[PDB]
Symmetry: D3
Subunit: 311 residues, 6 copies
């Protein structure tokens, strides 16, 4: 695992996270300020992270397609475009604003909050926060629906192969594409279901986190709809880093979805299967209890490309 290195996509789950999404100002000065801050993001990452012996603090910067075109008009990753909104038969995935993403993780909340503070300070009037979630780990790697969340993530070389751009787009080798969606749950509706009904919605057993048998696995379970098999029988993964969040006084119980892929075609096909259904109409039952409030796609440059921005 990388130590205090920007753009460390492959880091393991953490106890705390911060997801910041910002819009950049329209002026040339604002664009220059944003590029200065993000290209030098190793500065604040080390300024905060070096203070913890374990060096758990990580920070991944994503850049939206529209802002990318403002700063790197003549060179662009092959599949960078704004999040494509989905209108399913029942549920929809909106496309909401965002020019910059900071995906910050650490063993402690203070490290995440302080790095966010320093970044927001440095950006000043050049950018505006449009979404902010301070995520926390919930029991034994569970989400607020009470299921272990992240089990089938690829790890190690499989994670690198699934998440990072390779030979297919060599100018951007080592970058990634990340999609975020902030989901809010209907906990009263969810906790109406029996455990076995919930297991059929997800596709795994609840306490024990075991995938349902083939002959028990619904065609519209979350697991089935998010399993991506090509014509050669090869499976394709994304790398997810979801975290819980919420407010008891707003009855807000949330899962913040974040998913990295070497090609957003994989993540986008998962989203189509979830929202539109496979076959069409046979959509993901998780969406009957979970509403996406945001949806934004970013390019994650390699460190070399990030350092170059604004030049």
């Amino acid at each position: 695992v990388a130590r205090l290195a920007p753009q460390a996509v492959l880091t393991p789950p953490s106890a705390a996270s911060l997801f910041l999404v910002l819009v950049a100002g329209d002026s040339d000065d604002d664009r220059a300020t944003v590029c200065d801050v993000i290209s030098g993001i190793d500065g604040p990452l080390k300024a905060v992270g070096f203070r913890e012996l374990a060096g758990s603090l990580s920070c991944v910067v994503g850049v939206g397609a529209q802002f990318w075109d403002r700063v790197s008009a003549s060179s662009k990753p092959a599949h960078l475009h704004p999040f494509v909104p989905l209108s399913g038969p029942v549920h929809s995935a909106p496309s909401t604003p965002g020019d910059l993403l900071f995906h910050i993780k650490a063993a402690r909340k203070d490290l995440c909050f302080e790095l966010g503070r320093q970044i927001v300070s440095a950006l000043g009037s050049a950018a505006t926060v449009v979404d902010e979630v301070h995520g926390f780990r919930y029991f034994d790697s569970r989400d607020l629906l009470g299921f272990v969340d992240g089990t089938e993530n690829p790890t190690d070389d499989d994670a690198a192969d699934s998440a990072l751009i390779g030979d297919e787009d060599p100018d951007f080798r080592g970058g990634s594409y990340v999609i975020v969606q902030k989901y809010l749950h209907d906990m009263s509706a969810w906790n109406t279901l029996s455990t076995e009904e919930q297991e059929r919605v997800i596709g795994r057993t609840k306490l024990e986190n075991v995938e349902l048998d083939d002959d028990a696995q619904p065609s519209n379970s979350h697991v089935t709809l998010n399993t991506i098999v090509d014509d050669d029988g090869v499976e394709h993964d994304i790398l997810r880093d979801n975290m819980a969040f919420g407010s008891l006084g707003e009855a807000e119980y949330g899962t913040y979805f974040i998913g990295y892929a070497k090609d957003p075609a994989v993540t986008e096909l998962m989203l189509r299967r979830m929202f539109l259904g496979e076959p069409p109409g046979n959509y993901d039952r998780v969406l009957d209890f979970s509403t996406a409030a945001t949806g934004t796609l970013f390019f994650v440059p390699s460190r070399d490309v990030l350092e170059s921005l604004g030049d």
Copy 2:
């Protein structure tokens, strides 16, 4: 230190906290529901807290004067009354609503959040959250002004002597009185000051957390104004458990003040010295950078008295 015991006021600082303030509904049914939940608060405390081997989870329930009169009309602690608002020459301490306080602490946020979830679920329509703060520890026991915060707290027997009702009100022995105030900081104004100017505002050195020498200690420093000396030369302490909180996108940088005392006369005199000044006008410089958004006083019953509520 107590293990999974309601009303454990003397617990040491923690990495995470939750401060919930609620108003109770006006109906007899709502009053009964509230009394049922709080008198049996050991249930949810153990249901959540037993799941962590260390047993770090604690929960202190406070009850406001007005709600107290609804449920225990014939027996009342000697000094229970609503928070008295202060109108200083420059700054004010408002008195804001609250019938119930839950002061929850643990080594992890999930334990605090889950206990809060279970309590809010159990109360249902009988109470409404009016303030909610998820506090976090910031570096080496610091607040967001960058000073170590809690240093001079009494510990052990001194803490018991300072915080818990004794022989002076024997029907309520082992209870306490707690005041909360949610403060928001003007960080841009604060970080205009030099370190030495900030040290003179607080009354201690910043990195090293050492009290200023007598000949360097201002008469309006926070330390001076919060030092309470009686005519016999005896000092009187309160027990504080402040925590950081905030939102980067709202430029909200907060200190949640919580202070326990065996007699609210001590806490109230501190507040008068801070807001009104000693001499009058010579008010606490911390308030030039910190604004109180809430102010609420609660009685913390002993476990025996808490268990009795609603009977």
Copy 3:
């Protein structure tokens, strides 16, 4: 919590345990050896436990009624007798041999195993192991049935009041009475039940460990049958320290029950309600999935009384 002190009944749950039950030889020399080892048990406890900085190692010695009569013929705790076997309408609680119990706990298995090794070495031919279980903590304080196990234990002063002999038998003040039963589960039968059926067997929700509502709580749930209410409405607790154990190759999935009480009348009434039923026949559903292989009652002397044995 006590540090390296024999007879520390009130210790919190641990990650590892060892339960040893032995029978003493019939000779005077064997009796003397046993008394020498147990009266000086602080020796091995410190010899092993001092090697861990945290000092997590504890050791409680219990003595059976028959062996007690061999060594302290003229002075006996008021309620010491052999475990009374129960023959229920379906399930039975056998009374099985044991003169000595060592209930050993620590943060690590090696400390438990090494203390057991040293004790068995010291006893030599004077005693014979008749039951041995190396217990382990399972996830978030669960037993192998998948429920959090220990939630409603009394803690702190409530634990002392429930577990330790007081004014009622002053010659034995600070002692306790402990019952052990080694249970083996029918996991295939258990995992036939739905989650909700299992919750009705136990009396709490499974993942969330919340007691069922009064109007959902069966009369034959484990929680109902193990709730002991006297005529004055006062509840009576025992202090339990159960641990998981097993062998995959023997399909042995176990819960080792251990329960301390100041008067075995409480534990015995719980057992009658479980095995015989209340009303008679309405027995504890946990026993349809759990079979007791052992049942033995011991007196736990205070340290002062333990040190005196053999004199």
Copy 4:
């Protein structure tokens, strides 16, 4: 170090382990079930291991020569054969049954036990456990003979070079060969020896774990007999992961030997030197205090090869 990846041979020592050895049923259906479970072993490994933030859980699957021939008749690693039994002048190394090995390690026993439970459940009637040991770390990396055990293991690239198949058998690159032997000790005989006599048996000092000087090192010490030097003066290592186990009531004090090598010729030569002696008759003194109850050799396929099994 790998995270939740099957066939992770190079993992560092752990606090807990589980060694399971099974025989597969004779039927085609049983063979298919076994291949299904082992080829998809990443499923249970993640189902259990993802629940611990640290991701300490590992699982290495070994396959015996006879079972290998049932499932991969046309492609076989160069040196796969059943364990060759040794008959020394005094001690013998038996060859005992085993078609499947699961070498499971984690920071906690529950993770090892739960993964074993899930694997045994999935195999059902298709395989039978023939050996099962739950290993534990003993003090500062010691075995039950009281010596630090594992000191001279190769680490990092040396470990990869020693344990993993390379260019010499490219169809099986990244696999390994593992031998297990379950040893039981005669502790009363061992603890007759002086410390210095024990140091001469092992070849290192006891408390300090320092190799004996050349002029003090016996020709039949364990260290000498297990040092493998080729004609070019190059040394050859194996990668060992021994753990303690035992039962106090059976006077069973055990060391579970497990050793990985890229070519079983190295491990086999060590065993010959130990049991037969070098020169013949000059056998390893450790065997005067340690008796091998099992002896079984397995091929450890790379992940790619493991995933392919049963196809």
Copy 5:
């Protein structure tokens, strides 16, 4: 265990310590400065210690007999006098200067060093350091002779009864008497001995830390000479907190002895038995390998008495 409370004698062993011994200047101003610093020692203790969440930092202040007479001429503990030097047949225990002792302990060296820095700064020219040792824990609670050191310490109530002044000197109830001696070892001479010879010098087995059998225990072992039995057969303990220290380049391998007792008669009798021998001449063999460079006795006032000093 106490939290951030001066004069906490009963604290468990720690990973790091600092032993500071100082002489006070002769002037009235120097005496006043010393009394100001020590009576207010809770200030620096909290200033440093509050910065660690665990609150592991402790500080015990001792005051020498001569300095005591300068500051509290009309009230003195019953047994306060300067360390009495011993001249044995072979080895001697010198009496060396010291007016003030700070016995500082924590989980980390930085906390000990920083508290020492702040104390030395505050004392300035009013006192001079005459001995300074930064102690460290060595493996599993061992000293540099390789034996576990501290095993038979009293704990909990036994520690309070052994270390703290009670009804016998009520004006000083809760105080203690502490002796320090800095020992340097002859490691080359020690490591000439066999393990069994070393075990006979100490009185316990080396790796396993078990007291030798009565029929194997020499009359001049350290354990025998430091066992104090009165005419009624009652044993008397002291509370020790030894730590390792040293310098590789000076061939300095040290044990810092520190021992607390409610009456220095116990510690003094141990020292006589060690240095003079029982019978006379039969002195402690540890002293053939260990030379005392310092010897100083201090009174440890209760917190109340300490706070009063200089008034």
Copy 6:
């Protein structure tokens, strides 16, 4: 990160360290002893380090230019020479003796001290310690001047690229060049300065560890003088591992500087800029508060080259 591998330069910061510098004896026998010990340094490293489960212990051996010429007369790294002393306008960097460096790090002091003990024992009369510092981490990665120290270190591949010899000197690929300097501080002079004056001396803010703005950054700050930019605008880093040390009774407050580089030209240019100034005379203000007592340069051989020494 490497596990128990000699010459592991890239290891992250640790809680404890030991820096040993020795001079070798002049005789052929002494040279042979030194080569035997250092070429086999993996022996003691594993003998000590394997005893800690985490395997935190590391040991890097450096060899001085003069000793190198005694043992490897026909093959030498391209830039190995003795430390070049600097005589600045105010401050000087002396060149002081040293043939061998051991840079030892671990999570605990005992591991560092014990490895040092074993190395010094093995060297015996063949080498003499000339400098010895036991370093400790101070708060949140700070030095005794109160600044976070190490922030801008390169990590991961940047660290390898900065510290390790590559294609430019292929016979020594994987080696490094290390310079040590032991600095003592004038704390009374330092703590005269305001925080802002100290920030201008260092080039970063003190509590928050943020680099000063370009328009606030002095030309003679430590950060400016230690920033190395080539004509192509490429920056060049060194890898530093400084630690605090000191003695309160000697008023010795120290920073032990240790810096690794693939070519000592980088470290030497930093030192020239610090001591001589850029422009000449504009020297580093840190040196007005910090005096170098030692200065020594060593070659750090790769493991392969180290193992070969003395052959």
